[PDB]
Amino acid sequence: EEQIAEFKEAFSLFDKDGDGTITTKELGTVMRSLGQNPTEAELQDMINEVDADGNGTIDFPEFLTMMARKMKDTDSEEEIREAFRVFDKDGNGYISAAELRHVMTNLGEKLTDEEVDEMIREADIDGDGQVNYEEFVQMMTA
Amino acid sequence: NLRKRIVFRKISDVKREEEERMKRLPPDHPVRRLFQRFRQQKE
Amino acid sequence: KIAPIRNEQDKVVLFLCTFSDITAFKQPIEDDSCKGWGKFARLTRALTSSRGVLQQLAPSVQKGENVHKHSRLAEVLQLGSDILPQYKQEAPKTPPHIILHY
Amino acid sequence: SRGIDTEKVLQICPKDMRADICVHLNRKVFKEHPAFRLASDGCLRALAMEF
Amino acid sequence: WKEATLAQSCANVRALTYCDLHVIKRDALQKVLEFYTAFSHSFSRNLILTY
Structure with a gap:
């Protein structure tokens, strides 16, 4: 989910209008620059279907949905990303001991505090009190 | 003893846990099996 | 685009x-x-x-294909200058009309 | 190098300063190479003493 | 750490430009990595040689 952050430059380059959405003038300009001249009604229906609002303004989620649909990520990557989303209640991409206790209590698989701390240490590699992406995936690989 | 080390909790952490519980996984079968395997290995 | 480089010993x-x-x-x-x-x-x-500064003027104009290819090829064509060393221990030759102080 | 011995300057300082100096001198390889991005402080220092 | 044996160099390596190298001996690296098993379990997987 964090890989889509690089699309910001592409959106800015495509949206030369500078009004926060793709304008008809910008579409015509880029179309003429590229050289191809398809049907105008084709572009109208394409932008209407792409844009969620459908009022001629293209927003970020309109392109984000298409990018996500066309991504077709790997099953293991999707599983690990979903697991990280569900463990991190705050959604900041960080896992703490208290979050581990909260998810353990919610799931019902409660463990003793010593056991939770030992699991944290087993996942911990730099020994400062953090659990990271590569740490968890390396623990899962074994 | 430098080799031996103590385990503990923090006041702010337990306070925020109490606050969170006041404002209170069922389909998490694979990670549940993961936790079971980790507990069995630790046993 | 391909561009082989020669060698000081008269070889590629x-x-x-x-x-x-x-x-x-x-x-x-x-x-x-x-x-x-x-x-x-x-x-x-x-x-x-x-789409960067190489062809940044394309959206502001139309039918720019006649110069985009030339602009793209201009940078590649300069590789002959980098081929001058020819993968050899090129010495720092003195510029003309300048004499060493030793 | 002039009339300065790097080894002697290192041995003059105590162990903690020696380790910190080694980390600073070799910091390029740790911070650029991805293989060292999971390094704890102890292992990082034990390696830096040797490079 | 994997071969656990010494081998003959099969090719020569030569300098081109003024370069700086950071060299580590085999014995000290092996001792450190066997000391830090948790670090080695990721160091072996992440470190890939160029040649």
């Missing part, structure tokens, strides 16, 4: 092949995509180098 030792993407300015071809415009956006998103 190394090749040099350069690369560029023109996906956004060519005929659109797709194999398996969710939508046509989605595939178009995916293809155009990989043209950052061409």
